[PDB]
């Protein structure tokens, strides 16, 4: 059926530019208008721009006027968004969407969305995380269950992956969504609950992988005496 | 703010009771009201919560399907309907106001309790 | 600019329930209103257009109603596939979305297990102390974590993260991280997190002494 595939997202410094593209298939691209729509946790779903089937009329959200330009190549079935003078508040997942087929005297909106491409506007530089143990003790022990983990702190950009004992330990693992700190770096924890009787003899190691920096870190988590 | 529970008593297995929790000194329409219970030798344990009208009611595993909490905001009172009662339900039952309108469970004010005994 | 508002923000609901969510426009949009569904990590999907017309393939348990400023979406009998966030969108004058209504998986109440973790010596050597409080496998989502350092309430130096509902039991877990400098950390003794939740009859405190561990 209709398929839309975005590309071109990445990390960009404030004031620089980025060009997104959207490859369309499964429908006559040159017959339909197209939308760019973005989603950020702070502003929800937000329409960005529309272009006509023939590229004639273009319209833009007030918050991007003068900085963004929507365009299209009908011979290549491709939609484009040029983003200049980027700002932190432009950080979002950007989706292209196909205008639906409506009847002549009607308003219209979108029927099919792409899976999105992520744009991150930040002054932070690529950095692997520091990995610190979250040590079990009597203070993380309730009955026969103890909690332990790893703090994966001060990395940029997303994402990081965390495994335990090279993948042999999966039951009871919670890896939390990252929070963006006031420094502009991300931080998260990964924890696991285990039998309290295993502490001090069973080895527990968290394996942290941060592909943007090629960081791989194993951290052995040993109990404390309190 | 004062809370007082009533409606407890001696009931047969399979019987029904209705507990009431009347509040004075403060309008409780904006607050979630919770029921807890305590049996000898055990800790006070959660039974059910009536949040504000429209925000739903939530229940403990041990009473799901049998107990129902409701509100009479006009009369500043909340209720726990208890059906299909079991010996295991024997306890003193307490109501508490959640002082946090965003429902984090800040139970500052508690009633004195009403006794429920399921036997014979 | 037409303003769209949805209610409620979150609805805790169960399989088989009849569910109605509402969407209001700041001025008349006639019936130019669409409803899209979105699951985490996924693109939105068109459910309803022109306020009440179902998109092809959308199951018949969905319906929509309204014209002017007040609109509703109704699921006659909810199914697991319907747990998602729903957005309305007016397309009478440009395009603006509501804030979204999330259908949440209702379950029985479970109080959190509470654990605390002191900072590692490795991080202390680098001049910072992070202390972590973990609330494990609880429901409903609302909870309060308060950090106390020598029995003084902290504010402005902690951050929280909450998981999505667990695929197995639909519970939440929550991490709270208090971050101080090494000097501020060494200026005090007792570090505690105090936890409240509607499933707990009294607050649960976990604490340690600096230098005890």
Coordinates of C-alpha atoms in Angstrom, one line a residue:
Chain A
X1 CA 0.0 0.0 0.0
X2 CA 1.0 3.6 0.6
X3 CA 4.5 3.9 2.0
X4 CA 6.4 7.0 3.2
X5 CA 10.0 6.7 4.4
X6 CA 11.6 9.8 6.0
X7 CA 15.4 10.3 6.1
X8 CA 17.9 13.0 6.9
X9 CA 17.4 13.4 10.7
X10 CA 20.3 13.8 13.0
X11 CA 22.0 16.0 15.6
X12 CA 22.5 19.7 14.6
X13 CA 23.9 22.7 16.4
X14 CA 21.6 25.8 16.9
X15 CA 21.7 28.1 13.9
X16 CA 22.8 25.4 11.4
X17 CA 20.7 23.7 8.7
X18 CA 19.4 20.3 7.9
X19 CA 17.5 18.8 4.9
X20 CA 14.9 16.1 5.4
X21 CA 13.6 13.9 2.6
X22 CA 10.6 11.6 2.3
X23 CA 10.5 8.8 -0.3
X24 CA 6.9 7.9 -1.4
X25 CA 5.6 4.7 -3.0
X26 CA 2.4 2.8 -3.5
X27 CA 0.4 5.8 -4.9
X28 CA 0.6 8.4 -7.6
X29 CA 2.7 10.9 -5.7
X30 CA 2.2 13.7 -8.2
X31 CA -1.6 13.7 -7.6
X32 CA -1.5 14.5 -3.8
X33 CA -0.6 17.3 -1.5
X34 CA 1.8 16.5 1.3
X35 CA 2.4 17.5 4.9
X36 CA 5.3 17.8 7.2
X37 CA 4.1 17.3 10.9
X38 CA 6.3 17.1 14.0
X39 CA 6.0 15.7 17.5
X40 CA 7.9 16.7 20.5
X41 CA 7.2 15.9 24.2
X42 CA 6.8 19.6 25.0
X43 CA 4.5 20.7 22.1
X44 CA 2.7 17.5 21.1
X45 CA 1.7 17.0 17.5
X46 CA 2.3 20.1 15.5
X47 CA 1.6 20.7 11.8
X48 CA 4.6 22.2 10.1
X49 CA 4.0 22.7 6.4
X50 CA 1.9 21.7 3.4
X51 CA 2.7 21.6 -0.3
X52 CA 0.3 21.2 -3.3
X53 CA 0.4 18.3 -5.6
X54 CA 2.0 20.5 -8.3
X55 CA 4.3 22.3 -5.9
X56 CA 2.4 25.5 -6.5
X57 CA 1.0 26.6 -3.1
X58 CA 3.0 26.1 0.1
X59 CA 1.9 27.0 3.7
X60 CA 3.8 27.0 6.9
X61 CA 3.2 27.2 10.7
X62 CA 4.0 30.5 12.2
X63 CA 6.8 29.0 14.3
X64 CA 8.8 28.0 11.2
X65 CA 8.1 30.8 8.8
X66 CA 11.1 32.3 7.1
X67 CA 13.3 29.3 8.2
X68 CA 11.8 26.2 6.7
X69 CA 11.0 25.5 3.0
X70 CA 8.9 22.5 1.8
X71 CA 9.5 21.3 -1.7
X72 CA 9.0 18.2 -3.9
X73 CA 10.4 16.4 -6.9
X74 CA 7.5 14.5 -8.6
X75 CA 9.8 12.8 -11.1
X76 CA 11.6 11.2 -8.1
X77 CA 8.5 10.8 -5.9
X78 CA 10.3 12.7 -3.1
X79 CA 9.2 15.3 -0.6
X80 CA 11.7 17.7 1.0
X81 CA 12.0 20.0 4.1
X82 CA 14.9 22.4 4.2
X83 CA 15.3 23.6 7.8
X84 CA 17.5 26.7 8.3
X85 CA 18.4 28.6 11.5
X86 CA 17.5 25.7 13.6
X87 CA 16.6 26.2 17.3
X88 CA 16.4 23.9 20.4
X89 CA 12.6 24.0 20.3
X90 CA 12.7 22.5 16.8
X91 CA 13.9 19.2 18.3
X92 CA 11.2 16.6 17.4
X93 CA 10.3 13.6 15.3
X94 CA 9.4 14.8 11.8
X95 CA 6.8 12.9 9.8
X96 CA 5.8 13.3 6.3
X97 CA 2.1 12.5 5.6
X98 CA 0.0 12.1 2.5
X99 CA -3.1 14.3 2.1
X100 CA -6.1 12.0 1.7
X101 CA -8.4 11.9 -1.3
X102 CA -11.4 14.1 -0.7
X103 CA -14.2 15.5 -2.8
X104 CA -13.9 18.8 -4.5
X105 CA -15.8 21.1 -2.1
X106 CA -14.3 19.7 1.1
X107 CA -11.5 20.5 3.5
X108 CA -8.8 17.8 3.7
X109 CA -6.2 16.3 6.1
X110 CA -3.8 13.4 6.0
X111 CA -4.5 9.6 5.8
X112 CA -1.0 7.9 5.8
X113 CA 2.0 8.9 7.9
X114 CA 5.6 7.8 7.6
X115 CA 7.5 6.4 10.6
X116 CA 9.3 9.7 11.2
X117 CA 12.9 10.8 11.4
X118 CA 14.4 12.4 14.5
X119 CA 15.9 15.9 14.6
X120 CA 17.9 17.0 17.7
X121 CA 19.0 20.6 17.9
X122 CA 21.6 20.9 20.7
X123 CA 25.0 22.4 21.5
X124 CA 26.1 19.2 23.3
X125 CA 29.0 17.2 21.8
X126 CA 29.0 13.4 21.3
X127 CA 30.1 11.7 24.5
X128 CA 29.8 8.2 25.9
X129 CA 28.2 7.7 29.3
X130 CA 30.0 7.2 32.6
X131 CA 28.7 4.0 34.1
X132 CA 28.5 3.7 37.9
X133 CA 27.2 0.7 39.9
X134 CA 24.0 0.9 42.0
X135 CA 25.2 -1.3 44.8
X136 CA 22.8 -3.7 46.6
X137 CA 22.7 -3.6 50.4
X138 CA 20.2 -4.1 53.2
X139 CA 18.8 -0.8 52.0
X140 CA 17.9 -2.4 48.7
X141 CA 16.8 -5.7 50.2
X142 CA 13.2 -6.6 51.0
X143 CA 12.8 -10.2 52.1
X144 CA 14.2 -12.6 49.6
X145 CA 14.5 -9.9 46.9
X146 CA 17.3 -7.4 46.3
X147 CA 17.6 -4.6 43.8
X148 CA 20.8 -3.6 42.1
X149 CA 21.7 -1.7 38.9
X150 CA 23.8 0.7 36.9
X151 CA 23.6 4.5 36.4
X152 CA 24.4 5.5 32.8
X153 CA 25.1 9.2 33.2
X154 CA 26.1 12.2 31.0
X155 CA 25.9 10.9 27.5
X156 CA 24.9 12.4 24.2
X157 CA 23.0 11.8 22.0
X158 CA 20.4 9.1 22.4
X159 CA 20.3 6.1 22.4
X160 CA 22.1 3.7 24.8
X161 CA 21.5 0.0 25.2
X162 CA 22.0 -1.9 28.5
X163 CA 22.2 -5.7 28.9
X164 CA 22.9 -7.8 32.0
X165 CA 25.5 -10.6 32.2
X166 CA 25.9 -10.4 28.4
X167 CA 22.2 -11.1 27.9
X168 CA 21.9 -14.1 30.2
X169 CA 19.9 -12.0 32.8
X170 CA 16.6 -10.5 31.5
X171 CA 14.0 -11.4 34.0
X172 CA 13.2 -8.4 36.3
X173 CA 15.2 -5.8 34.4
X174 CA 13.8 -2.3 34.1
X175 CA 15.8 0.1 32.0
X176 CA 14.3 3.6 32.5
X177 CA 13.6 6.2 29.9
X178 CA 16.4 8.7 29.7
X179 CA 16.0 12.2 31.2
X180 CA 17.7 15.2 29.6
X181 CA 19.7 17.0 32.3
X182 CA 20.2 20.8 32.5
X183 CA 23.7 20.2 31.1
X184 CA 22.1 19.0 27.8
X185 CA 23.3 15.4 28.5
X186 CA 21.2 12.4 29.0
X187 CA 21.1 10.1 32.0
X188 CA 19.3 6.9 32.9
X189 CA 19.4 3.9 35.2
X190 CA 19.0 0.2 34.6
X191 CA 18.0 -2.0 37.6
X192 CA 17.2 -5.6 38.2
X193 CA 15.7 -7.5 41.2
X194 CA 17.4 -10.8 42.1
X195 CA 17.3 -13.3 45.0
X196 CA 18.8 -11.8 48.1
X197 CA 20.6 -15.1 48.8
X198 CA 22.6 -14.7 45.6
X199 CA 24.3 -11.4 46.6
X200 CA 28.1 -11.6 47.1
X201 CA 28.5 -14.9 45.2
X202 CA 26.6 -14.5 41.9
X203 CA 28.3 -12.1 39.6
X204 CA 26.2 -9.3 38.1
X205 CA 27.6 -7.1 35.3
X206 CA 25.8 -4.5 33.2
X207 CA 26.9 -4.1 29.6
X208 CA 26.4 -0.5 28.3
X209 CA 26.7 0.3 24.6
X210 CA 26.6 3.8 23.1
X211 CA 27.0 3.5 19.3
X212 CA 27.4 7.2 18.5
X213 CA 30.7 7.3 20.5
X214 CA 31.6 3.6 20.1
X215 CA 31.5 3.3 23.9
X216 CA 31.3 -0.2 25.4
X217 CA 31.5 -0.4 29.2
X218 CA 31.1 -3.4 31.5
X219 CA 30.5 -2.6 35.1
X220 CA 30.5 -5.3 37.8
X221 CA 27.9 -4.4 40.5
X222 CA 29.1 -5.6 44.0
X223 CA 27.2 -5.3 47.2
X224 CA 27.9 -2.8 50.0
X225 CA 28.1 -3.7 53.7
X226 CA 25.3 -1.4 55.0
Chain B
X1 CA -11.1 17.4 59.8
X2 CA -12.8 14.4 61.4
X3 CA -13.7 11.0 59.9
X4 CA -16.1 8.4 61.4
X5 CA -16.8 5.0 60.1
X6 CA -19.9 3.0 60.7
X7 CA -21.8 -0.1 59.4
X8 CA -19.5 -2.8 60.6
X9 CA -20.7 -5.9 62.6
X10 CA -21.0 -9.6 62.8
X11 CA -22.0 -11.3 59.5
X12 CA -22.2 -14.8 58.1
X13 CA -20.0 -16.1 55.3
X14 CA -21.6 -15.1 52.0
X15 CA -23.3 -12.2 53.7
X16 CA -23.2 -8.5 52.9
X17 CA -22.4 -5.3 54.8
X18 CA -22.1 -1.6 53.9
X19 CA -19.6 0.6 55.6
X20 CA -19.9 4.4 55.7
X21 CA -17.3 7.0 56.3
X22 CA -18.7 10.5 57.1
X23 CA -16.5 13.5 57.2
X24 CA -16.9 16.8 59.1
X25 CA -14.9 20.0 59.1
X26 CA -14.0 19.9 55.4
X27 CA -15.7 19.3 52.1
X28 CA -14.2 16.1 50.7
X29 CA -15.6 16.2 47.2
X30 CA -12.1 17.2 45.8
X31 CA -10.3 14.4 47.7
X32 CA -9.8 10.7 47.0
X33 CA -11.1 8.6 49.9
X34 CA -9.5 5.2 50.7
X35 CA -10.5 2.2 52.7
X36 CA -7.8 0.1 54.6
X37 CA -8.2 -2.8 56.9
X38 CA -6.2 -4.5 59.7
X39 CA -6.5 -8.0 61.2
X40 CA -4.6 -9.1 64.4
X41 CA -0.9 -9.7 63.7
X42 CA -0.9 -8.2 60.3
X43 CA -0.1 -4.7 58.9
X44 CA -2.8 -2.3 57.8
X45 CA -3.5 -3.1 54.2
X46 CA -5.1 -1.3 51.3
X47 CA -8.7 -2.2 50.3
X48 CA -10.0 0.3 47.9
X49 CA -10.0 4.0 46.8
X50 CA -12.7 6.3 45.4
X51 CA -11.1 9.1 43.6
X52 CA -13.1 12.2 42.6
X53 CA -16.3 11.6 40.7
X54 CA -15.2 10.7 37.2
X55 CA -11.6 9.7 38.1
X56 CA -12.5 6.1 38.9
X57 CA -12.2 3.6 41.8
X58 CA -9.4 1.2 42.3
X59 CA -9.3 -2.1 44.3
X60 CA -7.0 -4.6 46.0
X61 CA -6.6 -8.1 44.5
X62 CA -8.2 -9.6 47.6
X63 CA -11.6 -7.8 47.2
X64 CA -11.9 -7.3 43.4
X65 CA -15.4 -8.3 42.2
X66 CA -16.8 -8.4 45.7
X67 CA -16.4 -4.9 47.1
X68 CA -17.5 -1.6 45.6
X69 CA -16.7 1.9 46.8
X70 CA -19.0 4.9 46.1
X71 CA -19.5 8.5 47.0
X72 CA -22.3 10.7 48.3
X73 CA -20.5 14.1 47.9
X74 CA -23.7 16.0 48.7
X75 CA -23.6 14.4 52.2
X76 CA -19.7 14.4 52.5
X77 CA -19.8 10.6 52.9
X78 CA -18.2 7.6 51.2
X79 CA -19.2 4.0 51.2
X80 CA -17.8 0.5 50.9
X81 CA -20.3 -2.2 49.8
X82 CA -19.0 -5.6 50.8
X83 CA -20.6 -8.7 49.2
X84 CA -19.7 -12.4 49.4
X85 CA -17.9 -11.9 52.6
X86 CA -15.3 -14.5 53.8
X87 CA -13.7 -15.2 57.2
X88 CA -10.5 -13.8 55.7
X89 CA -12.3 -10.4 55.5
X90 CA -12.5 -10.2 59.3
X91 CA -10.7 -7.0 60.3
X92 CA -11.2 -3.4 61.6
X93 CA -11.8 -1.2 58.5
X94 CA -10.6 2.4 58.3
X95 CA -11.2 5.3 56.0
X96 CA -8.5 8.0 55.2
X97 CA -8.5 11.2 53.1
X98 CA -5.8 11.5 50.5
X99 CA -4.8 15.1 51.1
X100 CA -3.1 15.3 47.7
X101 CA -5.6 16.3 45.0
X102 CA -3.2 14.7 42.5
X103 CA -3.6 11.3 44.3
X104 CA -0.1 10.5 45.6
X105 CA -1.6 9.0 48.8
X106 CA -0.9 11.6 51.5
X107 CA -3.1 10.1 54.2
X108 CA -3.1 12.7 56.9
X109 CA -6.6 12.2 58.3
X110 CA -7.9 8.8 59.4
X111 CA -11.1 7.5 61.0
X112 CA -11.2 5.5 64.2
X113 CA -12.3 2.3 62.5
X114 CA -15.4 0.0 62.4
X115 CA -15.2 -3.7 63.3
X116 CA -16.1 -6.4 60.8
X117 CA -16.3 -10.1 61.9
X118 CA -17.3 -12.8 59.4
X119 CA -18.0 -16.1 61.2
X120 CA -20.4 -19.0 61.8
Chain C
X1 CA -5.5 30.0 15.5
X2 CA -8.2 27.5 16.6
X3 CA -7.5 25.9 20.0
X4 CA -8.3 22.2 20.5
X5 CA -8.6 20.6 23.9
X6 CA -9.2 16.9 24.8
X7 CA -10.6 15.4 28.0
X8 CA -9.5 13.5 29.9
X9 CA -5.7 13.4 29.5
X10 CA -5.6 9.8 30.8
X11 CA -8.4 7.3 31.1
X12 CA -7.8 4.1 33.1
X13 CA -10.0 1.5 31.4
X14 CA -10.6 -2.2 31.0
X15 CA -11.2 -4.6 28.2
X16 CA -15.0 -4.7 27.4
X17 CA -15.7 -1.2 28.7
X18 CA -17.6 1.4 26.7
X19 CA -15.3 4.4 26.4
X20 CA -16.1 7.9 25.3
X21 CA -13.5 10.7 25.0
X22 CA -14.2 14.3 24.2
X23 CA -12.6 17.0 22.0
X24 CA -13.6 20.7 22.0
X25 CA -12.7 23.5 19.6
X26 CA -12.4 27.1 20.6
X27 CA -14.7 28.1 17.7
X28 CA -17.0 26.4 15.3
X29 CA -15.1 24.0 12.9
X30 CA -18.4 22.6 11.4
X31 CA -17.7 18.8 11.2
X32 CA -14.1 19.1 9.8
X33 CA -12.6 16.9 12.6
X34 CA -10.4 13.8 12.4
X35 CA -9.3 11.3 15.0
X36 CA -5.9 9.6 14.9
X37 CA -4.5 6.8 17.0
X38 CA -0.9 6.4 18.1
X39 CA 1.1 3.8 20.0
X40 CA 4.5 4.5 21.5
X41 CA 7.3 4.5 19.0
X42 CA 4.8 4.3 16.1
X43 CA 3.3 6.7 13.7
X44 CA -0.3 8.0 14.1
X45 CA -3.1 6.2 12.2
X46 CA -6.3 7.7 10.8
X47 CA -9.4 6.4 12.5
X48 CA -12.2 8.9 11.8
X49 CA -12.8 11.8 9.4
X50 CA -15.5 14.4 9.0
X51 CA -16.3 13.8 12.7
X52 CA -18.2 10.6 12.2
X53 CA -17.0 8.6 9.1
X54 CA -14.8 5.6 9.8
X55 CA -11.7 5.1 7.7
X56 CA -11.6 1.9 5.7
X57 CA -10.4 -1.1 7.8
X58 CA -11.3 0.5 11.1
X59 CA -13.3 -1.9 13.3
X60 CA -17.0 -1.2 13.8
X61 CA -16.7 -0.7 17.6
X62 CA -15.4 2.8 16.8
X63 CA -17.7 5.7 16.3
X64 CA -17.6 9.5 16.4
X65 CA -20.1 12.3 16.9
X66 CA -20.4 16.0 16.9
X67 CA -20.6 19.2 14.9
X68 CA -19.6 22.8 15.7
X69 CA -17.4 22.8 18.9
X70 CA -18.1 19.6 20.8
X71 CA -17.0 16.1 19.6
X72 CA -16.7 12.6 21.0
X73 CA -15.1 9.4 20.0
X74 CA -16.6 6.2 21.4
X75 CA -15.4 2.6 21.5
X76 CA -18.4 0.4 22.2
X77 CA -16.4 -2.5 23.7
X78 CA -12.7 -1.9 24.3
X79 CA -10.1 -4.4 23.1
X80 CA -6.4 -4.7 24.0
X81 CA -5.4 -3.3 20.6
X82 CA -7.2 0.0 21.6
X83 CA -4.8 0.9 24.4
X84 CA -3.1 3.9 22.8
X85 CA -3.2 7.7 22.7
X86 CA -6.0 9.3 20.7
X87 CA -5.6 12.8 19.1
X88 CA -8.3 14.9 17.5
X89 CA -7.5 17.3 14.8
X90 CA -9.5 20.2 13.2
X91 CA -8.9 20.8 9.5
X92 CA -11.5 23.6 9.1
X93 CA -8.7 26.3 9.2
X94 CA -5.2 24.9 8.7
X95 CA -4.5 22.0 11.1
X96 CA -4.3 21.9 14.9
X97 CA -4.3 18.9 17.2
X98 CA -5.6 18.3 20.6
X99 CA -3.2 17.3 23.4
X100 CA -4.3 13.7 23.2
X101 CA -6.1 11.2 25.4
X102 CA -4.3 8.1 26.6
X103 CA -6.2 5.0 27.3
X104 CA -4.4 3.3 30.2
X105 CA -4.6 -0.3 31.3
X106 CA -6.5 -0.5 34.6
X107 CA -5.5 -3.1 37.1
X108 CA -5.6 -3.8 40.8
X109 CA -3.6 -1.6 43.2
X110 CA 0.0 -2.6 44.1
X111 CA 2.1 -0.6 46.4
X112 CA 5.7 0.0 45.3
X113 CA 8.8 -1.8 46.7
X114 CA 11.3 0.9 47.7
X115 CA 15.1 0.6 47.4
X116 CA 17.9 3.2 47.8
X117 CA 21.4 3.2 46.3
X118 CA 24.3 5.3 47.6
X119 CA 26.8 6.9 45.2
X120 CA 29.7 4.8 44.0
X121 CA 33.2 5.5 45.1
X122 CA 34.2 5.9 41.4
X123 CA 31.7 8.8 40.9
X124 CA 32.7 10.3 44.2
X125 CA 36.3 10.4 43.1
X126 CA 35.1 12.5 40.1
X127 CA 33.5 15.2 42.3
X128 CA 29.8 14.3 42.1
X129 CA 27.4 12.2 44.2
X130 CA 24.2 10.6 42.6
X131 CA 21.8 8.9 45.0
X132 CA 19.1 6.7 43.5
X133 CA 15.7 5.8 44.9
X134 CA 13.7 3.0 43.1
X135 CA 10.0 2.4 43.3
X136 CA 9.3 -1.0 41.8
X137 CA 6.2 -2.6 40.2
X138 CA 3.4 -0.3 41.5
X139 CA -0.1 0.7 40.3
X140 CA -1.7 3.3 39.9
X141 CA 0.9 5.6 38.4
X142 CA 0.7 8.4 40.9
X143 CA 3.4 8.5 43.7
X144 CA 5.4 11.0 45.6
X145 CA 9.2 10.7 46.3
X146 CA 10.7 13.2 48.7
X147 CA 14.5 13.4 49.3
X148 CA 15.6 14.3 52.8
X149 CA 19.3 15.1 53.6
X150 CA 19.8 15.3 57.4
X151 CA 15.9 15.5 57.7
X152 CA 15.8 18.6 55.4
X153 CA 13.5 18.4 52.4
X154 CA 15.3 18.8 49.1
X155 CA 14.0 20.6 46.0
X156 CA 15.4 21.4 42.6
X157 CA 18.2 18.9 42.6
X158 CA 16.5 15.6 41.6
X159 CA 15.0 14.1 38.5
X160 CA 12.5 11.3 37.9
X161 CA 11.9 8.8 35.2
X162 CA 8.8 6.5 34.9
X163 CA 8.6 3.3 32.7
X164 CA 5.7 2.4 30.4
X165 CA 3.2 -0.1 31.8
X166 CA 4.9 -3.5 32.0
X167 CA 3.9 -5.9 29.3
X168 CA 3.4 -8.7 31.8
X169 CA 1.6 -7.1 34.7
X170 CA 0.9 -3.5 33.6
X171 CA 2.7 -2.0 36.6
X172 CA 5.0 1.0 36.7
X173 CA 8.5 1.5 38.1
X174 CA 10.0 4.8 38.9
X175 CA 13.6 6.1 39.4
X176 CA 14.5 9.3 41.3
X177 CA 18.0 10.6 41.1
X178 CA 19.4 13.2 43.6
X179 CA 22.6 14.8 42.4
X180 CA 24.9 16.8 44.6
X181 CA 28.5 17.9 44.4
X182 CA 31.1 15.9 46.3
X183 CA 31.5 18.8 48.7
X184 CA 27.8 19.2 49.3
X185 CA 27.5 15.5 49.7
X186 CA 30.3 15.3 52.3
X187 CA 28.7 18.2 54.2
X188 CA 25.9 15.9 55.4
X189 CA 25.3 12.5 57.0
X190 CA 21.8 11.0 56.5
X191 CA 20.3 10.5 53.0
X192 CA 16.7 9.3 52.8
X193 CA 13.9 8.9 50.2
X194 CA 10.4 9.0 51.6
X195 CA 7.7 7.5 49.4
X196 CA 3.9 7.8 49.4
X197 CA 1.4 6.0 47.2
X198 CA -2.3 5.4 47.5
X199 CA -1.6 1.7 48.2
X200 CA 0.6 2.5 51.3
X201 CA -1.1 3.2 54.6
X202 CA 2.0 5.1 55.8
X203 CA 5.1 6.6 54.0
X204 CA 8.0 4.3 53.3
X205 CA 11.4 5.6 54.0
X206 CA 14.7 4.1 52.8
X207 CA 17.9 5.8 54.1
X208 CA 21.7 5.4 54.6
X209 CA 24.5 7.3 56.4
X210 CA 27.4 8.6 54.4
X211 CA 30.4 6.6 55.4
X212 CA 28.2 3.7 56.6
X213 CA 28.4 1.8 53.3

